[PDB]
Design a protein around this ligand. Structure first.
Ligand SMILES: Cc1cc2nc3c(=O)[nH]c(=O)nc-3n(C[C@H](O)[C@H](O)[C@H](O)CO)c2cc1C
Lengths: 220, 209
């Protein structure tokens, strides 16, 4: 029955190029209209193109018009999406789907997609900055202190406190994949502001990929 | 440009009905579709031409529309109905669209998010960079919305929010980061991170001091 399979997605750098492919089975590709819809990690679905069965018409989203070009081979039941002049923002998962034939043109069957990453991210180490409040949140019974493990690559990062001693109140958040292909994550340990100026709070960030280990002692 | 204004999140109890909307200026002239996308899975068609319904989509998924608002009504909510739903249609001269999407959650005791806001460390500032960190903890169901404010004015340039994460206590964790330049951080007089979850809105603020 109906089945769509992407491929070609991979990891490339800005400006570079890449050509995705979508091969279908279970139906006559030549009888339908095809589209590519992409989705950046954790974001909505964004429409890219539509291509008429006889290929006489090709429609592209402003964001990609000029750099991306759709093509097909109804004989080889294949759709193709050649992307050139890559941008970071083009990074997302590329889905090719069969465009339905009723109502305006929504698709009906989507392939699982092929992931397209695009960065120059090499192997930076994390910078570690102290996370403490100004004067308002400092005047509580139990404020929070933490370490900002900014701009690193690639995952994962290990955070701890007082070389493993402190465990309660600790909350190491999941890393955020900033635009510049580099990860960042925070780690806060909630503690009483009473015995705050007597005890020591030191996170121990570990980033083997970079062979880095940092120890920042945060003070109130 | 144009928008399929779609509520970011929606939650319902196992067995009850759920209703997702999708506003739009041209919806009265164009059809509306609905797709279901389960985490890390290709989207799936559930509604077409406003009310059509595929022969694999259970009858409880009822598409409808009128004027400038299409509505995907899912009755007898199931645990499997937990996923992202997007509406589709197009502009006033054929170019296809997609709504922001909506998150559909099910059941466990509902909880409000623990928001904490941090200003840029004087240290990172010395590095000619500023970064406001907004940690969102212990919320349920796992769906939140993060908007940043520059002195009560909104801003989008420089925001990177994470995808709700499951903590060990079966509640969710989220983090949002607003990157400024040492100059902007001092430019304004207050930056605020507002995390709205289930109609509820927690808004912590910080200012250069
Ligand atoms: C941006 C755009 C996308 C279109 N996509 C489709 C499509 O997927 N399927 C279809 O049958 N017609 C589509 N059409 C209509 C198609 O171009 C053509 O006008 C009609 O089939 C008339 O021959 C589209 C028109 C535009 C402007």
């Amino acid at each position: 029955e109906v089945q769509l399979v992407e491929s070609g997605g991979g990891l490339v750098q800005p400006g570079e190029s890449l050509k995705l492919s979508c091969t279908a089975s279970g139906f006559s590709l030549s009888n339908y209209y095809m589209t590519w819809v992409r989705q950046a990690p954790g974001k909505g679905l964004e429409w890219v193109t539509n291509i008429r069965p006889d290929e006489t018409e090709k429609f592209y989203s402003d964001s990609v018009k000029g750099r991306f070009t759709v093509s097909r081979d109804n004989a080889r039941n294949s759709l193709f999406n050649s992307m050139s002049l890559q941008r970071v923002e083009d990074t997302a998962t590329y889905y090719c789907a069969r465009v339905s034939d009723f109502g305006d043109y929504g698709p009906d069957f989507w392939g699982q997609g092929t992931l397209v990453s695009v960065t120059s991210a090499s192997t930076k180490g994390p910078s570690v900055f102290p996370l403490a409040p100004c004067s308002r949140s400092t005047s509580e019974s139990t404020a929070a202190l933490g370490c900002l493990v900014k701009d690193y690559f690639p995952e994962p990062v290990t955070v701890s406190w007082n070389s493993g001693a402190l465990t309660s109140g600790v909350h190491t958040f999941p890393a955020v994949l900033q635009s510049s292909g580099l990860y960042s994550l925070s780690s806060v340990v909630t503690v009483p502001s009473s015995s705050l100026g007597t005890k020591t709070y030191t996170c121990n960030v570990n980033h083997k990929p970079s062979n880095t280990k940092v120890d920042k002692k945060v003070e109130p | 440009s144009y928008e399929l204004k779609q509520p970011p999140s929606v939650s319902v109890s196992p067995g009850q009905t759920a209703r997702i909307t999708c506003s739009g200026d041209v919806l009265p002239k164009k059809y509306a579709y609905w797709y279901q996308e389960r985490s890390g899975q290709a989207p799936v068609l559930v509604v077409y031409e406003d009310s059509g319904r595929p022969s694999e989509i259970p009858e409880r998924f009822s598409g409808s529309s009128s004027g400038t608002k299409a509505t995907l009504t899912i009755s007898g909510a199931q645990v499997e109905d937990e996923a992202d739903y997007y509406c589709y249609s197009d502009i006033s001269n054929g170019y296809p669209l997609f709504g922001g999407g909506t998150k559909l959650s099910v059941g466990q005791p509902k909880a409000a998010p623990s928001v904490t806001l941090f200003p840029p460390s004087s240290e990172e500032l010395q590095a000619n960079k500023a970064t406001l960190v907004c940690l969102i903890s212990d919320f349920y169901p796992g769906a939140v919305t993060v908007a940043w404010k520059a002195d009560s004015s909104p801003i989008k340039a420089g925001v990177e929010t994470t995808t709700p994460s499951k903590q060990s206590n079966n509640k969710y964790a989220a983090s949002s980061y607003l990157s400024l330049t040492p100059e902007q951080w001092k430019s304004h007089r207050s930056y605020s991170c507002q995390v709205t979850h289930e109609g509820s809105t927690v808004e912590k603020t910080v200012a250069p001091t």
